[PDB]
Ligand binder design. Sequence first.
Ligand SMILES: [Mg+2]
Ligand SMILES: [Mg+2]
Ligand SMILES: [Mg+2]
Ligand SMILES: [Mg+2]
Ligand SMILES: [Mg+2]
Ligand SMILES: [Mg+2]
Ligand SMILES: [Mg+2]
Ligand SMILES: [Mg+2]
Ligand SMILES: [Mg+2]
Ligand SMILES: [Mg+2]
Ligand SMILES: [Mg+2]
Ligand SMILES: [Mg+2]
Ligand SMILES: [Mg+2]
Ligand SMILES: [Mg+2]
Ligand SMILES: [Mg+2]
Ligand SMILES: [Mg+2]
Ligand SMILES: [Mg+2]
Ligand SMILES: [Mg+2]
Ligand SMILES: [Mg+2]
Ligand SMILES: [Mg+2]
Ligand SMILES: [Mg+2]
Ligand SMILES: [Mg+2]
Ligand SMILES: [Mg+2]
Ligand SMILES: [Mg+2]
Ligand SMILES: [Mg+2]
Ligand SMILES: [Mg+2]
Ligand SMILES: [Mg+2]
Ligand SMILES: [Mg+2]
Ligand SMILES: [Mg+2]
Ligand SMILES: [Mg+2]
Ligand SMILES: [Mg+2]
Ligand SMILES: [Mg+2]
Ligand SMILES: [Mg+2]
Ligand SMILES: [Mg+2]
Ligand SMILES: [Mg+2]
Ligand SMILES: [Mg+2]
Ligand SMILES: [Mg+2]
Ligand SMILES: [Mg+2]
Ligand SMILES: [Mg+2]
Ligand SMILES: [Mg+2]
Ligand SMILES: [Mg+2]
Ligand SMILES: [Mg+2]
Ligand SMILES: [Mg+2]
Ligand SMILES: [Mg+2]
Ligand SMILES: [Mg+2]
Ligand SMILES: [Mg+2]
Ligand SMILES: [Mg+2]
Ligand SMILES: [Mg+2]
Ligand SMILES: [Mg+2]
Ligand SMILES: [Mg+2]
Ligand SMILES: [Mg+2]
Ligand SMILES: [Mg+2]
Ligand SMILES: [Mg+2]
Ligand SMILES: [Mg+2]
Ligand SMILES: [Mg+2]
Ligand SMILES: [Mg+2]
Ligand SMILES: [Mg+2]
Ligand SMILES: [Mg+2]
Ligand SMILES: [Mg+2]
Ligand SMILES: [Mg+2]
Ligand SMILES: [Mg+2]
Ligand SMILES: [Mg+2]
Ligand SMILES: [Mg+2]
Ligand SMILES: [Mg+2]
Ligand SMILES: [Mg+2]
Ligand SMILES: [Mg+2]
Ligand SMILES: [Mg+2]
Ligand SMILES: [Mg+2]
Ligand SMILES: [Mg+2]
Ligand SMILES: [Mg+2]
Ligand SMILES: [Mg+2]
Ligand SMILES: [Mg+2]
Ligand SMILES: [Mg+2]
Ligand SMILES: [Mg+2]
Ligand SMILES: [Mg+2]
Ligand SMILES: [Mg+2]
Ligand SMILES: [Mg+2]
Ligand SMILES: [Mg+2]
Ligand SMILES: [Mg+2]
Ligand SMILES: [Mg+2]
Ligand SMILES: [Mg+2]
Ligand SMILES: [Mg+2]
Ligand SMILES: [Mg+2]
Ligand SMILES: [Mg+2]
Ligand SMILES: [Mg+2]
Ligand SMILES: [Mg+2]
Ligand SMILES: [Mg+2]
Ligand SMILES: [Mg+2]
Ligand SMILES: [Mg+2]
Ligand SMILES: [Mg+2]
Ligand SMILES: [Mg+2]
Ligand SMILES: [Mg+2]
Ligand SMILES: [Mg+2]
Ligand SMILES: [Mg+2]
Ligand SMILES: [Mg+2]
Length: 248
Amino acid sequence: GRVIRGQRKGAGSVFRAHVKHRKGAARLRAVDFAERHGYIKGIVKDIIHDPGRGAPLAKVVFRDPYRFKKRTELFIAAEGIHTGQFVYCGKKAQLNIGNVLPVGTMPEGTIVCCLEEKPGDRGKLARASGNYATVISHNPETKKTRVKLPSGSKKVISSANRAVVGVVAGGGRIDKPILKAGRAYHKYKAKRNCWPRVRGVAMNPVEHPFGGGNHQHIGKPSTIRRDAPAGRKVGLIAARRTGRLRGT
RNA sequence: GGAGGUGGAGCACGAGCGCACGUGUUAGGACCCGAAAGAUGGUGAACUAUGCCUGGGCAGGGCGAAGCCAGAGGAAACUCUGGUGGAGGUCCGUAGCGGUCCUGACGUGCGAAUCGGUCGUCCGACCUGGGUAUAGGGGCGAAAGACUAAUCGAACCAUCUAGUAGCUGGUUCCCUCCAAAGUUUCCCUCAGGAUAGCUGGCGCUCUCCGCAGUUUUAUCCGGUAAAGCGAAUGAUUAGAGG
RNA sequence: AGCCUUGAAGCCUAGGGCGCGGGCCCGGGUGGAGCCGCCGCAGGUGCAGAUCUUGGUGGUAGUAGCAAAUAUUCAAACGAGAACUUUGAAGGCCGAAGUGGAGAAGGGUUCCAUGUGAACAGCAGUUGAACAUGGGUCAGUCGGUCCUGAGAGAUGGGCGAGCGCCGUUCCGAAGGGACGGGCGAUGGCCUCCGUUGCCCUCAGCCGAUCGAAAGGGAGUCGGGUUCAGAUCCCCGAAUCCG
RNA sequence: AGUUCUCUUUUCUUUGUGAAGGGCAGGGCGCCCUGGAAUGGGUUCGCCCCGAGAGAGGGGCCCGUGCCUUGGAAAGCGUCGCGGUUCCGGCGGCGUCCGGUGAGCUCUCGCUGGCCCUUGAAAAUCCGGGGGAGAGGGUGUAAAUCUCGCGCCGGGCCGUACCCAUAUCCGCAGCAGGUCUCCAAGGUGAACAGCCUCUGGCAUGUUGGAACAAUGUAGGUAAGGGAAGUCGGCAAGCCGGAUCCGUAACUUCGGGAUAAGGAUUGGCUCUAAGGGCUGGCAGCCGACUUAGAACUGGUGCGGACCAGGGGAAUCCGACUGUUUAAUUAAAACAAAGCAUCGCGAAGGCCCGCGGCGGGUGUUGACGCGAUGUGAUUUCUGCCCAGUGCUCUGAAUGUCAAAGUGAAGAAAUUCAAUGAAGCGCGGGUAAACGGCGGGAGUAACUAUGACUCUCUUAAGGUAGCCAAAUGCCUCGUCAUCUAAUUAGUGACGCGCAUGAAUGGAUGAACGAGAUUCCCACUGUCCCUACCUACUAUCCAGCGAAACCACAGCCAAGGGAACGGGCUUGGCGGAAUCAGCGGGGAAAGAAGACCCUGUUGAGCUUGACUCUAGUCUGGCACGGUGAAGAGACGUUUUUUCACUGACCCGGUGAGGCGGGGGGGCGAGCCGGGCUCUCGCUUCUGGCGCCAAGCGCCCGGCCGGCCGGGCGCGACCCGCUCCGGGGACAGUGCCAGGUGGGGAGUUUGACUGGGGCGGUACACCUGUCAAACGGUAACGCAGGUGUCCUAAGGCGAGCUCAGGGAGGACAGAAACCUCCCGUGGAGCAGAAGGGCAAAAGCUCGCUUGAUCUUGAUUUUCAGUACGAAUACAGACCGUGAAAGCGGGGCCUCACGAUCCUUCUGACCUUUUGGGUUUUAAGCAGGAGGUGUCAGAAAAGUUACCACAGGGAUAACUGGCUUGUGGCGGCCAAGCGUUCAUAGCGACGUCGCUUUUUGAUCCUUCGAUGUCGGCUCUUCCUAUCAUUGUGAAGCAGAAUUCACCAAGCGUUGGAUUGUUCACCCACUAAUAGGGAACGUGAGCUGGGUUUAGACCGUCGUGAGACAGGUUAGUUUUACCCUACUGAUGAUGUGUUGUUGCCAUGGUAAUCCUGCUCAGUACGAGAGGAACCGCAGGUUCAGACAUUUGGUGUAUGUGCUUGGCUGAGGAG
Ligand SMILES: [Mg+2]
Ligand SMILES: [Mg+2]
Ligand SMILES: [Mg+2]
Ligand SMILES: [Mg+2]
Ligand SMILES: [Mg+2]
Ligand SMILES: [Mg+2]
Ligand SMILES: [Mg+2]
Ligand SMILES: [Mg+2]
Ligand SMILES: [Mg+2]
Ligand SMILES: [Mg+2]
Ligand SMILES: [Mg+2]
Ligand SMILES: [Mg+2]
Ligand SMILES: [Mg+2]
Ligand SMILES: [Mg+2]
Ligand SMILES: [Mg+2]
Ligand SMILES: [Mg+2]
Ligand SMILES: [Mg+2]
Ligand SMILES: [Mg+2]
Ligand SMILES: [Mg+2]
Ligand SMILES: [Mg+2]
Ligand SMILES: [Mg+2]
Ligand SMILES: [Mg+2]
Ligand SMILES: [Mg+2]
Ligand SMILES: [Mg+2]
Ligand SMILES: [Mg+2]
Ligand SMILES: [Mg+2]
Ligand SMILES: [Mg+2]
Ligand SMILES: [Mg+2]
Ligand SMILES: [Mg+2]
Ligand SMILES: [Mg+2]
Ligand SMILES: [Mg+2]
Ligand SMILES: [Mg+2]
Ligand SMILES: [Mg+2]
Ligand SMILES: [Mg+2]
Ligand SMILES: [Mg+2]
Ligand SMILES: [Mg+2]
Ligand SMILES: [Mg+2]
Ligand SMILES: [Mg+2]
Ligand SMILES: [Mg+2]
Ligand SMILES: [Mg+2]
Ligand SMILES: [Mg+2]
Ligand SMILES: [Mg+2]
Ligand SMILES: [Mg+2]
Ligand SMILES: [Mg+2]
Ligand SMILES: [Mg+2]
Ligand SMILES: [Mg+2]
Ligand SMILES: [Mg+2]
Ligand SMILES: [Mg+2]
Ligand SMILES: [Mg+2]
Ligand SMILES: [Mg+2]
Ligand SMILES: [Mg+2]
Ligand SMILES: [Mg+2]
Ligand SMILES: [Mg+2]
Ligand SMILES: [Mg+2]
Ligand SMILES: [Mg+2]
Ligand SMILES: [Mg+2]
Ligand SMILES: [Mg+2]
Ligand SMILES: [Mg+2]
Ligand SMILES: [Mg+2]
Ligand SMILES: [Mg+2]
Ligand SMILES: [Mg+2]
Ligand SMILES: [Mg+2]
Ligand SMILES: [Mg+2]
Ligand SMILES: [Mg+2]
Ligand SMILES: [Mg+2]
Ligand SMILES: [Mg+2]
Ligand SMILES: [Mg+2]
Ligand SMILES: [Mg+2]
Ligand SMILES: [Mg+2]
Ligand SMILES: [Mg+2]
Ligand SMILES: [Mg+2]
Ligand SMILES: [Mg+2]
Ligand SMILES: [Mg+2]
Ligand SMILES: [Mg+2]
Ligand SMILES: [Mg+2]
Ligand SMILES: [Mg+2]
Ligand SMILES: [Mg+2]
Ligand SMILES: [Mg+2]
Ligand SMILES: [Mg+2]
Ligand SMILES: [Mg+2]
Ligand SMILES: [Mg+2]
Ligand SMILES: [Mg+2]
Ligand SMILES: [Mg+2]
Ligand SMILES: [Mg+2]
Ligand SMILES: [Mg+2]
Ligand SMILES: [Mg+2]
Ligand SMILES: [Mg+2]
Ligand SMILES: [Mg+2]
Ligand SMILES: [Mg+2]
Ligand SMILES: [Mg+2]
Ligand SMILES: [Mg+2]
Ligand SMILES: [Mg+2]
Ligand SMILES: [Mg+2]
Ligand SMILES: [Mg+2]
Ligand SMILES: [Mg+2]
């Protein structure tokens, strides 16, 4: 057989991300003395559409505490922030939508977005439009916090991780039917070469495990073990169950 | 050390070595020509496939979404009527792009895919130039095993390589003499080999008793043809007397 | 002590013969320089075939054919020669999505003048994009040149038997610059200023480089002019940059 | 300048001003000031705007490509007129003028809106602003400075022609192909449509002349009919623009929709309405439109061009979109929607030989990655047994290396321990998939709600169906027709329907499949005519395919279909136009089929591996506390540490500790518990130090200028965080591993496959009286069994029968008699056997050890089996003897390797001892394909070498079967065998059935059916002439001579076949390579795409359905059709003969005979005559019809010649 499409996606080539018109990587501020010990002020200059991303991005301007300069940051825009608003980042910022605070200082039940996976990484969790994490509890002895992620998993993270108060803007996006293949053509023309998707059973056995046959059938179970070699790991990968999810 | 059996490619008064010529068998390109393949290293995205960058392009009509204006009705909710408006992977249809049927033309063509009428679509998942990216068990594929320079169910180039072929084709002067086999056994043996038989050549040991695809005379051997079933085995018809 | 310019090989021949045959001898002609008998040696040594190789030639056969896109005619000229060339006049066609006028890619002299009519232009030609002999492309302002794009690609580093490969800010002492100030040295319109060396002071760019004759990118227009060049030459009037 | 016969103050051409600067229109402003607005107002085609300031006034700015002006009239152009060397930017006159209009077209500038789960580059480069470090002069000879106006100098290098495409480029070429752009006139018209014209261009596309035959290619037209044609309406035809009217089912309310169906349309002359400017009015200007009316023509008018046929349904797919470049455009693919699955980053998925490598990722679960289904609507049932996937694990079977323990001289052996994985247990079907059988039963019959029973993991639920899925099958009923293998609607024990392997539906849509209806027609009945280009003939020019030699037939035989050969018929130069019978014509070493110890693509439960991946050990690999062990050391568990190692951030910018200061608490002002480090209202600003303290320099306490410190705490060893002795990496070991690699996937065989085993053996037969002897010949057996069923000895005698004896009988046991084996001897059969070879006892291990010879198969090899001996040991018997397996004929296995037994055995390499190892001899472990490879599929995506050794056509032999025909005569026929039939039997013929066979063809003979066309057979349906009937007539039946002439139109089906409708004299049957594809067609079959069912894990398969799928060449020879001609008659002509060859007419209706013969009646003929018709043939055009480019004559659309007229 030949190399299957899933195998070919890894080599880059025609499967690389379309990043020509993107505005930059969205991140928090790099952690420095002001955020470690106090707060720093910023002003929301603009809120912009980012090609390929559902959530809007906010362009925030800070003062440089060591040089006569203005620093432009590119944040995930929490819902409800507006241009000309002041946002504040640091240990002693106040609990307001759009401010950046360590999760250790936030009371239980706070709703946050663009949360750091590790202290200082500048925001990695709950960045998709409409999403957010929640604060469950703190352990000041171990200096750690328990948060609930948009997938529903609960994670233990360092209390020093920063986050933005509120939920990401642009929520409810998936509630609209696309209605058109052409509208899905445009959705992914901004993202990457992944659309449309041809089915495994619709190919020949040379390019897919499910291909071939005088009937379009899988022929073999579609739940494939976790350790199957690349080019065989297709279908339901390491599925714990299958069928209709009935119940809780 | 003896006697008596038995295994040896031995001894029993050498015959070898060297050189040359022929014939045969074989290892080598191996009598000559012939695969589908496999391997190594390289050249191609000027066609085409797909992503990206930067440019160009797409008459005239039909239908008439939301929004809005006015008049009418109504207790309210709101309803009705006439206009305005100009949406759409919307419709007819040009350029363009494509290529349904005639199973039309042509079929040593104009053409290694073209031509005519008729047809699909024609603001979009649209058409297109150049730039750039992906290279051969690799790419790329809205998926036909499609496309990847007239090459694709694995490109092209050189080499390995005069690849192997129990298989097809061919195999070049004269006269003279002799002259077959298609059968036995073994073989992943059944289009092939080895093996015995059948042939030829070289002789040599004798001769001018031996032998014989023959009969004769003796002497054995045999269970077929025929015959038999009022003889065994098997099969089978009719009466008769007890 | 072979043959041969008093004629070798080769070739041709309704000439005379020999041999069962393979073949050979002699005669005549052409030819123009070498060749053969016998004893031995050696072999890339004998063709009718292989859809054999290469070259040549037939019949087919003066045959298929020279039928896509409406169309030609009259007179004159040159000339050996005219259905096809030139001029004039008619009749037609393309019918501004052109059979018009200009470019890009590609070609590379095909462009222009004169000459030829051998070959080629599937009839002909007095004609041609053929052949021959000579010419023709002029820029601060139109492009390239510069920028970066998708991307490509060195160094540091890493990997690698190795040619090398990965990688493009990532494991890097990555600045050879500057207003100014202070110490000197040299010169000149020697008055005092330049230049120049060192020290002090100041200093993010953070990625060499390549990448578009359609993207970004200052500034040229009118008239005339040649066989062929012109927003380039000449005339006139301007303008950007330094 | 054109026209002017007539008219036309006419028609045509032409009638400029660059850049840059200045000015002014015009356009735009989300710009300013006054002011304060509801009775809200302003305002656009739409919008939209306002107390966050509308209207109204007055300003400002930006673009001004428009106009004026300098440029600049000097130039250019038009026209007229003069000169020259006359190849002069030659010189002169005049002119280059005044207005209108527009949803017009093209370009551009601007305003305003809509669309996006799409938001639509970067950089070089240039500019403005904020700040104020600095500099400049001291009132002048002014300075620093100036983005102002002039002036001065320079701008190097490379490209530049021309073509730019029915002849400059790529397709071998001047190739009907391909190849990116810019400008873009008048008329008609909605129009960049088509048609005509101007500017510009061209010469008909690599030649001309003359004809006007066939057959073509491309256009047309056809009376009457109207799909009867054909697989199928293929093709053509109909409709078509616009206005006015009108418009159904169904529907997702958007559509359907140009539904369907009507009417109108020309020309001319008018009427009305629809506006602008200046000053309810007046005047002056204007742009095309709409509506209405009269008149008018031979009812013609969207007059050319342009330009939808329609309706009722069924299947499939929602749609738009895409696709096999070059045979498949589709129902296939995609799609939105739906549902699953993995993953929280040291991660999921993937790349990569390699790493601190790479893609997703400029990403973060509303995400990325992997699958299935396929819009909406409605629903999606049961099954976790199987196969997968997944989850739990010291509780725990197996389990590698390493490590631990014991034995030993050690090698080594043994033991304990026990990672993953497997086993074990849960979950899971929108994972792959799956979802029964029998019997009885309701008061007629039928069904059978109901019951019993076997049964699996469920036993097919809702639905749906002869569906693209049902074999039987052309299912049954109904509808559609005259007639229907078609369609539709129902039915449903459904070979083999069914629920995201999605079931059912349903609007809109479709170059998708199918049926019917209206309309239309040359598809047809049934063909004809016309036009153009060919073909044709000529001048010029000029190939190629192909070719053993060739080219007339019948039969024969022959490699079974001859051009050649045999026997006959016969044969006459050279040619032209056609033609498609033959040359089993050409084209390509057959793709089908088989064989090959030839492949390749693909699959998997094949064999052997392998990347990756999971898992354990060793190393890098450290520090310290505890817990549990073992004897101060050492193993292990937990908890920590950091310094290796890893990760993240940053321009490595304030880290740890202490000091200093502020608010609180609290003990008797001080000490501490302990916390804090100066920014949160506003879409400002924020650096390059102020201040203070202390030193220093230069000049005259005063000026000028420097340095340090505090401001800005001190000390520190990793920049700051996060991990961390683990990730990870290196090397080993176990598991997984069609993701990938290589390879295999027997043979025989009346083709192969399936089936068998005739593959190694044995008995009887074949087998033809020695032996041998074949077939997928016939009847059978074999892979064992036996401590005795081996060996010896003795003693007995068996099967069966007769007759007797308590229970006792057909059969128990006892007795006598007969008994040649009719029993038994393990088994298949054949042979053999009676004081034995059988049965029963006693004793035994000759079934032991050993060398040779021989026999059988045979090559005179091996094995196996067997035969005589010889040497030992033995058994048995009194002994002779007999016995080294079974009474005989079968019962079995090389080399290499392993294992055992044997010797005071040999070797173990410099010697010696000892373990080990190797030798030598004999057994065993096994190859059954049995003289002995280690081995699964599929290919319709397929390949090569061959094969007529071998299948799929024809032909050939045969003729079982099929068909047809006799003979006998029991019967039938009321009677009566034979008018007509005919059993039980039996003899033939035929090659239009199917077989059987494999002779020809696999370097190819085109595979069904139809169409068309000719010919032949007779086994006769009709017709002519006849014979016989159970022949009264009529009708019918049987038979004879007999193939002259006929044997038809249709519905369903691809059909051959079949069936039905209808007409008819009749509706006979057949051959010609199952006649006929260089004759067609291509419906079926039979490539590649795709769907369904059944089957398969799968790739894939299916004499099962379904849909779409390239049909090549003639100019050669012959034959045939026509056309010139040839011989020789001296030449030449006219008129003739006819040898030979062809050959043709056919059948039916009416009237009359005649309501007659005949007959009870009912019914009901015939000959002769008369009048017509059918089929066929040969002509013909007076008539009717068709054609019509006489391009004949009217009419007419658009354009063109100024108009008329003529065109
Ligand atoms: Mg595979
Ligand atoms: Mg496919
Ligand atoms: Mg020999
Ligand atoms: Mg060779
Ligand atoms: Mg040899
Ligand atoms: Mg190989
Ligand atoms: Mg390209
Ligand atoms: Mg459309
Ligand atoms: Mg359309
Ligand atoms: Mg065709
Ligand atoms: Mg042709
Ligand atoms: Mg690759
Ligand atoms: Mg396929
Ligand atoms: Mg070769
Ligand atoms: Mg062979
Ligand atoms: Mg063998
Ligand atoms: Mg052979
Ligand atoms: Mg016998
Ligand atoms: Mg006999
Ligand atoms: Mg001669
Ligand atoms: Mg010479
Ligand atoms: Mg030689
Ligand atoms: Mg030769
Ligand atoms: Mg030769
Ligand atoms: Mg000719
Ligand atoms: Mg042109
Ligand atoms: Mg030109
Ligand atoms: Mg010529
Ligand atoms: Mg020229
Ligand atoms: Mg590189
Ligand atoms: Mg550059
Ligand atoms: Mg450029
Ligand atoms: Mg106002
Ligand atoms: Mg003038
Ligand atoms: Mg300032
Ligand atoms: Mg030029
Ligand atoms: Mg012409
Ligand atoms: Mg011409
Ligand atoms: Mg041409
Ligand atoms: Mg031509
Ligand atoms: Mg007609
Ligand atoms: Mg008619
Ligand atoms: Mg019909
Ligand atoms: Mg018919
Ligand atoms: Mg049609
Ligand atoms: Mg309709
Ligand atoms: Mg579709
Ligand atoms: Mg595509
Ligand atoms: Mg195709
Ligand atoms: Mg097609
Ligand atoms: Mg699924
Ligand atoms: Mg299960
Ligand atoms: Mg059911
Ligand atoms: Mg029909
Ligand atoms: Mg039905
Ligand atoms: Mg289900
Ligand atoms: Mg199914
Ligand atoms: Mg000619
Ligand atoms: Mg022949
Ligand atoms: Mg002869
Ligand atoms: Mg023929
Ligand atoms: Mg042929
Ligand atoms: Mg062959
Ligand atoms: Mg072949
Ligand atoms: Mg073989
Ligand atoms: Mg293979
Ligand atoms: Mg291959
Ligand atoms: Mg296996
Ligand atoms: Mg595998
Ligand atoms: Mg494999
Ligand atoms: Mg075989
Ligand atoms: Mg005999
Ligand atoms: Mg005895
Ligand atoms: Mg003995
Ligand atoms: Mg015995
Ligand atoms: Mg061996
Ligand atoms: Mg297939
Ligand atoms: Mg098949
Ligand atoms: Mg046959
Ligand atoms: Mg018969
Ligand atoms: Mg009787
Ligand atoms: Mg044969
Ligand atoms: Mg035979
Ligand atoms: Mg042949
Ligand atoms: Mg033929
Ligand atoms: Mg007869
Ligand atoms: Mg036939
Ligand atoms: Mg034929
Ligand atoms: Mg054909
Ligand atoms: Mg077909
Ligand atoms: Mg097919
Ligand atoms: Mg299945
Ligand atoms: Mg007439
Ligand atoms: Mg007429
Ligand atoms: Mg007129």
